[PDB]
Design a protein around this ligand. Structure first.
Ligand SMILES: *[C@@H]1O[C@H](CO[C@H]2O[C@@H](C)[C@@H](O)[C@@H](O)[C@@H]2O)[C@@H](O[C@H]2O[C@H](CO)[C@@H](O[C@@H]3O[C@H](CO[C@H]4O[C@H](CO)[C@@H](O)[C@H](O)[C@@H]4O[C@@H]4O[C@H](CO)[C@@H](O[C@@H]5O[C@H](CO)[C@H](O)[C@H](O)[C@H]5O)[C@H](O)[C@H]4NC(C)=O)[C@@H](O)[C@H](O[C@H]4O[C@H](CO)[C@@H](O)[C@H](O)[C@@H]4O[C@@H]4O[C@H](CO)[C@@H](O)[C@H](O)[C@H]4NC(C)=O)[C@@H]3O)[C@H](O)[C@H]2NC(C)=O)[C@H](O)[C@H]1NC(C)=O
Ligand SMILES: *[C@@H]1O[C@H](CO[C@H]2O[C@@H](C)[C@@H](O)[C@@H](O)[C@@H]2O)[C@@H](O[C@H]2O[C@H](CO)[C@@H](O[C@@H]3O[C@H](CO[C@H]4O[C@H](CO)[C@@H](O)[C@H](O)[C@@H]4O[C@@H]4O[C@H](CO)[C@@H](O[C@@H]5O[C@H](CO)[C@H](O)[C@H](O)[C@H]5O)[C@H](O)[C@H]4NC(C)=O)[C@@H](O)[C@H](O[C@H]4O[C@H](CO)[C@@H](O)[C@H](O)[C@@H]4O[C@@H]4O[C@H](CO)[C@@H](O)[C@H](O)[C@H]4NC(C)=O)[C@@H]3O)[C@H](O)[C@H]2NC(C)=O)[C@H](O)[C@H]1NC(C)=O
Lengths: 214, 444, 444, 214
């Protein structure tokens, strides 16, 4: 097989910027390289074939190039509807292989995550389990680290995290960290804390709740 | 115009099969070469298959070679994929694409998920995440709902049937050991929530489960009215005391160790330290090895004081007293015991054989008759070749006509042991017997 | 020491007479002139009277001349004062005072209170003044008790029946429209107030009222639940009711007459006849020939109601109620008895001959063995040629290993009758028996 | 009848001082005159008779003198045990008449009244009335004014206060002011305030309670 190597794996840049994605191939593929665009959710649409040949629609700002083993795609004046994942694919021989992908991220001013802690639901307790959920909404950059603390300031490891893709409108991210215990084990302690560390603030953003009431 | 609508395929376990159809419209389908491409959950792309203009020439990457069969019917305008002997690896999104040029997919279909798994379908559980009891009032009253434990993807979570879509977030479900978990957070603005309701709407296809958990505010932990057995102008008497004699066996037997027990019931769990004072013959035996210790119970405490005695002390008509006291006691409660003074008659002990009209059943009944004896106090057991026999039952002693007592001890045994002759003996122990111990048996 | 205790103080309508006594005891009465002096509630003192050792020379002020006459009874040491036409002005504290010699009272008694008023005597009401619910903790946990609405003066207010005297304050009771009101404040030490029972003790002479209001803490409102709709008193301590089942033989035998008894104990001559009510499964069997005797014993009376029952009635586990009623009963007490549902097994009855090693003595022992039966209720007797034999004794039934019951019936007889052959038979009657009665016999 | 006039009717003097209380008659009574001393809540005790002859038990401090028509009791070094009312009775002729008396108070250092409010007892409420009691304990001078205030600061008139005589030991006074309302009229209000004004403090000593709990 001829494995393609798209680089980098993800990129962030401001609007209007000109950015270059690249692909490399083990064996020579002459000029048989396509470039696809997959905006989060929607299907991939063909952007460029025969290395430079632009497909219908593709506004001039997209430019393919290269030959032999290295090819590059280049977007000028990043227009919002570019945010997607790009993949190159050789078409010299069988099997047809793609080159991993390169995901696009827009750059924006930093923003402070709105956190919120949620004690298990009485409905869940009745069931026999306890899940404390913490929502670190609307923020940027993606880099953030959260850590749970039971009584006092004791950290835990049995968590389940999940972030979303960069939001269309806000350009921000969101995350939902969930600690899942057993009723009993949840009952042995009193305080629960969701501690968040993030570029925006020096002092860790913390939201805590005491089981002493609810 | 040109549109590809592949469809079919849901969920199937490993080793299974599934037929993927691809509907083509908008072009002379009969003139193009078609591709089947799959994108795994990891978002990576893989070329599944290619087919010639009129079939015949087909190609499949090593991976799928032997398992897949791409085909077409240049009539119904449909591209197909015959997947067989499925492996986990094949779990991915499937799209059919058209070759509109020099080795390039120009048009793709919508796509159809296929997950191969040896897991059973599980309906989810929804939980209304109301905010913290400590009502963090402000403006951004964010809420949320957890959807835990469901399989397989996906589920549709919507707030208020769709009416609310401004300020919501839905988190990509995660695979926690064969089961999924997803949460969604919504953030309201303006004094509108407590008043105007909000519900979490979640539906799961593979299990046909539509649940709507209304998010009700967090309310305090307290409920009213426990007992209705009328708190009448009632109460409890207080602790009670009882005293017990040693077993006639301990007392008549040198080796044994007789003891006098005093038991105190109805002890308040809040005042477990009762003062038990013992007295042999009105002279204090502070300690004298009085072994006390409590037991919890039905809901109360029971103190049990045991005072070891010297065999003779009991027989010499001494009087053991037990004086208990505690704060709730208006006056100390005392109890006394002493061996009842009276006549003494050795018991006539005979052993009766099972009645002839019973030598048929598998079990037989040996009867030990004990008569004309005083006082009540006695102890009889059955023995076999030395060891204390099991399965014998004793009547309580009854007062015969002539002021003496009698009583029987029944023994049930398997007929075989009876006719083959065995050492079954009635063994009585009573004060009026020489050496306080007789042993009767069957001259067989 | 020398003492002068006055007595006879109280309240009297205007125009009414009163006779005060001043018991003296500590010297030679006959050697002194005595006096009576009163002191208005306003505190002015007024000399009331004089009387020579003999009693033949008296002097009175103009304000009481005629209405009062002082007298003495040297034979009993007591002085006296009789007042006939009392006015409200005559209200004050009267003190009898011994004469010191030099025209001055060297010794005065305790004084007695006299109030002349048309008003009627009124018992007071005491109220424990616990501190504010907002537990103002500190050190000086001052408490108090209100004594309101009493007539006339005075009352005796003390804490802890007299012990607590430090930090206490008692306020000169005052009156508003024919009623007095007095309060006392004990500024007790922090320590732990709820540790030693602090009680407000108040007594009123004119009404013989001694009340002790324990001062209990004003706890936080709204936590438990009020009386769970409990009605008027449905019980008390007085007559007792007991119910009794007919004897196994009476019911199981057609001929015999089954009876259900209800006995009521603990009653005296003040409460004679008592109400009786019998109801089979609540059906109004209005005194169905229920004979009800009234016996005599230790000092009380015991009523015995007997209701003849229908054999099959009891056998069908029907309910038999007994409702007792009388004036002293806050609510009627009704008992209930019935036949318990239970497994049944037929008694395997055997008769055992006296052991060979006993064919010497004049008497011999016939043994009747009854095993494997259910329920425990049974009746066995011995019979000779038809007549119910005498001299047999029955063990109480015992629970064998297999959940069934067994029991023996011993019969003692003169050997002559045994070897000569006689009709001795064990006759048992148990519900689980052919016609409720089997009757195994002997042979030789 | 012979009339006796005492002067002064009241006296307050600093512990240790010397008192010269008088007693006068309308006619000549030679030396027939007694002095009894009534301590509050107690029976009179004979102190001196026939002008100056001390009684038994009576300390050398007290000394009677004077004869004819005007006698004088004199307490050398005043002390707590001497807080009482003092009378001068005569015995020349009948009836034996006494004088008005003389109250005695000890001028000691000022003291701050310890106040305490007491809401009606549940036991009383059940009955149908309400008495709010306020105890203004151990204080001096006697001059003090208390006033009740219902909601906000509204004063009332149905008050019943009572005073104690100067206490033996602490030389202080005590008072019990009580407002008595109907259950109903007590309930249609919320705050209750006992306000005390007294030389010791410039700002009125206030203790209040709100029926919203008990
Ligand atoms: C919370 O629950 C408890 C218990 O829970 C049970 O409750 C019952 C109701 C059921 O629901 C059951 O399912 C629950 O588990 C409850 O009960 C307690 O209080 C009651 C009274 O309210 C009390 O009753 C007394 O019981 C006496 C009999 O006690 C013996 O036997 C019973 C079983 O029959 C057993 O449970 C006891 O533990 C005890 O057993 C003794 O134990 C001694 C040692 O303590 C052994 O001694 C051995 O001997 C030598 C050395 O001593 C050996 O070497 C060993 O080392 C040594 O251990 C004995 O062998 C063992 N006996 C047996 C047979 O195994 C009963 O006698 C007593 O009756 C008196 O009062 C009635 C009237 O009320 C009279 O009619 C009686 O006649 C008697 O009165 C005395 O009578 C004699 C003549 O007979 C007179 O001479 C006396 O003067 C006279 N008065 C006195 C003062 O003596 C009574 O019935 C229960 O036993 C208590 N429960 C227990 C477990 O102890 C609580 O009340 C409840 N809480 C509340 C608030 O309700
Ligand atoms: C004033 O004096 C009296 C009498 O004087 C005696 O004083 C003593 C000191 C001695 O000197 C003695 O010689 C004197 O006579 C005295 O006694 C009375 O008070 C006590 C209570 O303190 C009371 O005790 C109860 O007795 C119940 C049994 O009653 C029968 O048995 C007793 C003896 O045990 C006997 O004395 C009674 O006369 C009575 O006998 C009945 O009599 C009737 C008469 O009609 C017969 O009727 C049958 O019915 C029909 C037709 O009538 C049939 O066809 C038959 O033909 C017919 O005969 C009965 O057959 C006959 N039976 C017998 C056996 O003779 C007893 O049950 C009860 O015990 C229960 O309750 C206590 C609590 O109080 C529990 O601790 C027990 O454990 C038991 O509890 C029950 O247990 C069962 C299961 O076992 C449960 O199912 C129940 O739910 C459970 N609870 C209850 C509430 O039952 C208790 O022992 C005596 O009966 C009284 N005696 C008399 C004569 O009045 C007083 O104390 C004294 N008072 C004072 C202030 O000084």
């Amino acid at each position: 097989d001829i494995v393609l190597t798209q680089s980098p794996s993800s990129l962030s840049a401001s609007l209007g910027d000109t950015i270059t994605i690249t692909c490399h191939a083990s064996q020579n593929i002459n000029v048989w390289l396509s470039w696809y665009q997959q905006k989060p959710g929607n299907i991939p649409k063909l952007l460029i074939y025969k290395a430079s040949n632009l497909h219908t629609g593709v506004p001039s700002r997209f430019s393919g190039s290269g030959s032999g083993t290295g090819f590059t795609l280049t977007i000028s004046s990043l227009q919002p509807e570019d945010i997607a994942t790009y993949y190159c694919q050789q078409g010299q021989s069988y099997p047809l292989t793609f080159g991993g992908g390169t995901k696009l991220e827009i750059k924006r001013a930093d923003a402070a995550p709105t956190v919120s802690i949620f004690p298990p639901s009485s409905e869940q307790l009745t069931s026999g389990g306890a899940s404390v959920v913490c929502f670190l909404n609307n923020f940027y950059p993606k880099d953030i680290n959260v850590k749970w603390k039971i009584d006092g300031s004791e950290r835990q490891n049995g968590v389940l995290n999940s972030w979303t893709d960069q939001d269309s409108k806000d350009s921000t991210y969101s995350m939902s960290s969930t600690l899942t215990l057993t009723k009993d084990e949840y009952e042995r302690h009193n305080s629960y804390t969701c501690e968040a560390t993030h570029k925006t603030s020096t002092s860790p953003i913390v939201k805590s709740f005491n089981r002493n009431e609810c | 115009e040109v549109k590809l609508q592949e469809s079919g395929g849901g969920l199937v376990q490993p080793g299974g099969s599934l037929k993927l159809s691809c509907a083509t419209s908008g072009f002379t389908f009969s003139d193009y070469y078609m591709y089947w491409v799959r994108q795994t959950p990891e978002k990576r792309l893989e070329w599944v298959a290619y087919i010639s203009n009129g079939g015949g020439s087909t190609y499949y990457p090593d991976t799928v070679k032997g398992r897949f069969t791409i085909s077409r019917d240049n009539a119904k305008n449909t591209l197909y994929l015959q997947m067989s002997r499925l492996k986990s690896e094949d779990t991915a999104m499937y799209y059919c694409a058209r070759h509109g040029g020099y080795y390039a997919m120009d048009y793709w279909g919508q796509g159809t998920t296929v997950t191969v798994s040896s897991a059973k379908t599980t309906a989810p559980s929804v939980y209304p995440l109301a905010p913290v009891c400590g009502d963090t009032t402000g403006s951004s009253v964010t809420l949320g709902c957890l959807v835990k434990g469901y399989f397989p993807e996906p589920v549709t979570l919507t707030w208020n049937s769709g009416s609310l879509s401004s300020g919501v977030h839905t988190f990509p479900a995660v695979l926690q050991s064969d089961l999924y978990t997803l949460s969604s957070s919504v953030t309201v603005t303006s004094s509108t929530w407590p008043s105007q309701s909000i519900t979490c709407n979640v539906a799961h296809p593979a299990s046909s489960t539509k649940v709507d958990k209304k998010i009700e505010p967090r309310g305090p932990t307290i409920k009213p009215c426990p007992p209705c057995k009328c708190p009448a102008p009632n109460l409890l008497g207080g602790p009670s005391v009882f005293i017990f004699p040693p077993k006639i066996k301990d007392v008549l037997m040198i080796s044994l160790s007789p003891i006098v027990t005093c038991v105190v019931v109805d002890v308040s769990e809040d005042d477990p330290d009762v003062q038990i004072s013992w007295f042999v013959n009105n002279v204090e035996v502070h300690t004298a090895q009085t072994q006390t210790h409590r037991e919890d119970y039905n809901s109360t405490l029971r103190v049990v004081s045991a005072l070891p005695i010297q065999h003779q002390d009991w027989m010499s008509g001494k009087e053991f007293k037990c004086k208990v006291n505690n704060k709730d006691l208006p006056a100390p409660i005392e109890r006394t015991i002493s061996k009842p003074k009276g006549s003494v008659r050795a018991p006539q002990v005979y052993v009766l054989p099972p009645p002839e009209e019973e030598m048929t059943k598998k079990q037989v009944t040996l009867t030990c008759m004990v008569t004309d004896f005083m006082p009540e106090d006695i102890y009889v057991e059955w023995t076999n070749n030395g060891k204390t026999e099991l399965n014998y039952k004793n009547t309580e002693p009854v007062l015969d006509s002539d002021g003496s007592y009698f009583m029987y001890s029944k023994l049930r045994v398997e007929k075989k042991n009876w006719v083959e002759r065995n050492s079954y003996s009635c063994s009585v122990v009573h004060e009026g017997l020489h050496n306080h111990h007789t042993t009767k048996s069957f001259s067989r």
